[PDB]
Design a protein around this nucleic acid. Structure first.
Ligand SMILES: Nc1nc2c(ncn2[C@@H]2O[C@H](COP(=O)(O)OP(=O)(O)OP(=O)(O)O)[C@@H](O)[C@H]2O)c(=O)[nH]1
Ligand SMILES: Nc1nc2c(ncn2[C@@H]2O[C@H](COP(=O)(O)OP(=O)(O)OP(=O)(O)O)[C@@H](O)[C@H]2O)c(=O)[nH]1
Ligand SMILES: Nc1ncnc2c1ncn2[C@@H]1O[C@H](COP(=O)(O)OP(=O)(O)OP(=O)(O)O)[C@@H](O)[C@H]1O
Ligand SMILES: Nc1ncnc2c1ncn2[C@@H]1O[C@H](COP(=O)(O)OP(=O)(O)OP(=O)(O)O)[C@@H](O)[C@H]1O
Ligand SMILES: [Mg+2]
Ligand SMILES: [Mg+2]
Ligand SMILES: [Zn+2]
Ligand SMILES: [Zn+2]
Lengths: 346, 345
DNA sequence: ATCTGTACATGTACAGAT
DNA sequence: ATCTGTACATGTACAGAT
DNA sequence: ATCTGTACATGTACAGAT
DNA sequence: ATCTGTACATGTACAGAT
């Protein structure tokens, strides 16, 4: 098949993984030890997340996601204007970051300042800190090795209480992964990251939960195991990610779109079509096509609910204007009806 | 038919409540005594096991199994005459039970304590059953409701890798899968004071069997509220009842026990891993195929421990050929005559 | 002398390489 | 089909701290 | 160290619907 | 006769308090 050849292209090479991982691990481990010392972030723990650790990173091992998570007991959340995803956090450490509440930007700034200092003390490899992109929770490292490698170091508050009310009807896996899995997942802590949209607001993260789902994605426990049957769930994810990555390289009109949109859409599809047999590798083309059809409906109807926070619409008018969505619809529709020309590109 | 039989075997909510309330009082009191004193068993934790906690108890809530498990670091095990299941253990509180940790010595003190604490119970009708030699159990007989047996089982907990005799056991890769198997084998393993000799312990996987019983499907949703019911547990019940009824009648079958049936059905669940191979609509076929399987075990004199493949529960050394031929005839009869014994009281 | 946070020891799933 | 590198979970040894 | 509070899975009991 | 919906009961994992 055509799509199998595309995935062959997208497949990471073990040589590149080794070289990327070795450098990334040195930098991260060093940053993590620095957080442990008079440091307000003493106690932070490393949590590897995103595509590389989910085995859905494509083309190159050039972007890695890490959470430096800090357990903060006895906190109270206030939901910020019924957004579902944004909260203010309240209660001689943390002293410097109180603002009458726990300021995201103040904590992020110190976190960042420390990172930057520790980065200057690295003569072992070519690494700098990318200029801060306002509103973003990330502190991003740019490494030169062989190639360019981005590492987004994400500060995260860990709460071990029950998940916020806004998530009660989220994570609708009962028909797919089931009730025991859902209950167990919801006993895991939840995370808040310093993303604004205000300077004191945090955003929920479920990167840990998304990771478990990606690596435990079948209705059968043996899905993709050595004594089970391979599905094409991850492969569809990759193909869709690549379509967006290629389109986004070309078209500035698509700046508002990101990979989390496609991750969220495919979670919905995996819920809608829970049976492993609905993701047979022999049906890769049909499965990818049905994913595209689903995504086009999301754009057309201007609706893509957060998998974990049903009332939060990632495709609302407030986040992405209609024109951007019409633009992306035409572009997907085109690729779909012309043999995916863009998959040959570069 | 078989549905009517299961209706009969179904425990009543009323009886469960009353049984559980009394059992929990006694157990909790015994458990506090193992601590609050200082003992030698300070640190023991409660682990509920067996049929009641697996939801495969039949007829009445009249037998409960509990492990008082004790974490013991620096265990070295020596396999006792290549049995697979029996070990001597080597090594601080437990000093008085040693050159080797003696099962019977530890069991005796454990038992003595229990007996003393039982004498101090005036609110409940409860005594300690006469010791059955070789047995790891300390058994309580409770009366106030009806008769209720509680087997309190001493268990050593080791956090190391499982003994090599188990390496090829737990063959769930095609059923529950590799991630499940790996995780299960990261759990501790247990030794209980069952002799064979007075210093020997036996491996227990009651914790693992419990997880399997409550996580028994190839689909994650098997028997969940947004999944489909299978008849796996129902077959277990019917088979347990056939043996329980037969054992009531025939002294020839003293050597057989419910663990044999549990072990056999684990093998069947491995052989037939698909949930659709255990559709409730096929209860009769499923029960029948279980019987066929069990008869083959008797005929071939072979029923390997699910966790310890080289340990044959149906060896000549453990159960005489004649006992196995006797049980075969009796099962074969019930099977070909509409299970008359299921209508018995 | 004893205690412990850090690092290592062991084992295997997943996926890429042969 | 088999072999191998990375990541990740759990257990435990031990130099440095008390 | 132990105890309680929360949340939900696994049961059963029974009436109304199919 | 069976199935579904609600209520009523126990068990159990884990967090926060003591
Ligand atoms: N692991 C993890 N990384 C996150 C999370 N949120 C954000 N990030 C990282 O931070 C990057 C930027 O976050 P965005 O949500 O894109 O924030 P932004 O750049 O201000 O806004 P947009 O790009 O317009 O969405 C992401 O691409 C991730 O690398 C999270 O919950 N978990
Ligand atoms: N939870 C648990 N209970 C056990 C275990 N081994 C034995 N028991 C309990 O102890 C009782 C007796 O165990 P058996 O192995 O039958 O002991 P026995 O009477 O010496 O031997 P048999 O002649 O085979 O009956 C069981 O019915 C259980 O209640 C074990 O590994 N775990
Ligand atoms: N808008 C968002 N809301 C919530 N979580 C998000 C959001 N954006 C990203 N994340 C989380 O952060 C993780 C890392 O983000 P990132 O943008 O690197 O995507 P990714 O899934 O790693 O894919 P890739 O890096 O290959 O594009 C995501 O997997 C997701 O768990
Ligand atoms: N011979 C044995 N070898 C290993 N484990 C055993 C053995 N006999 C019993 N067990 C374990 O002890 C548990 C309790 O045993 P018991 O005889 O009470 O059976 P059960 O499974 O509780 O069923 P029931 O009590 O309804 O007959 C079993 O479930 C099993 O885990
Ligand atoms: Mg990423
Ligand atoms: Mg029992
Ligand atoms: Zn799969
Ligand atoms: Zn089932």
């Amino acid at each position: 098949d055509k799509l199998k050849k595309v995935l062959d292209k997208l497949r990471l090479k073990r040589k590149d993984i080794s070289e990327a991982a070795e450098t990334v691990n040195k930098v991260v481990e060093r940053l993590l030890r620095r957080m442990q010392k008079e440091s307000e972030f003493k106690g932070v723990e490393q949590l590897n997340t995103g595509s590389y650790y989910e085995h859905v990173k494509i083309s190159a091992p050039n972007q890695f996601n890490v959470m430096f998570k800090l357990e903060v007991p006895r906190i109270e959340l206030q939901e910020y204007y019924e957004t579902g995803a944004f909260y203010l956090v309240k209660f001689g450490p943390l002293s410097h970051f109180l603002e009458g509440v726990l300021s995201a930007t103040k904590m992020l700034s110190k976190f960042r300042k420390i990172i930057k200092e520790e980065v200057k003390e690295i003569k072992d490899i070519d690494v700098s800190v990318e200029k801060e992109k306002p509103g973003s929770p990330a502190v991003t490292l740019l490494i030169r090795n062989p190639e360019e490698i981005s590492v987004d170091i994400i500060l995260a508050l860990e709460s071990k209480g029950s998940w916020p009310i806004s998530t009660k009807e989220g994570l609708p896996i009962q028909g797919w992964l089931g009730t025991k899995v859902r209950t167990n997942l919801r006993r895991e802590p939840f995370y808040l990251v310093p993303k604004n949209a205000q300077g004191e607001t945090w955003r929920l993260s479920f990167s840990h939960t998304e990771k478990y789902i990606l690596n435990n994605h079948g209705i059968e426990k043996t899905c993709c195991e050595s004594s089970g049957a391979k599905c094409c769930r991850k492969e569809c994810l990759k193909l869709m990610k690549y379509l967006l990555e290629q389109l986004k390289k070309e078209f500035q009109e698509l700046d508002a779109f990101c990979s989390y949109h496609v991750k969220t859409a495919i979670f919905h599809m995996w819920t809608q079509d829970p049976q492993d047999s609905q993701w047979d590798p022999r049906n890769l083309s049909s499965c990818f096509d049905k994913l595209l059809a689903f995504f086009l409906e999301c754009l057309r109807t201007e609706k893509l609910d957060h998998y974990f926070i049903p009332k939060f619409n990632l495709f609302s008018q407030e986040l992405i204007d209609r024109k951007s969505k019409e633009f992306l619809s035409k572009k997907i529709e085109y690729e779909r009806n012309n043999g995916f020309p863009i998959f040959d590109k570069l």
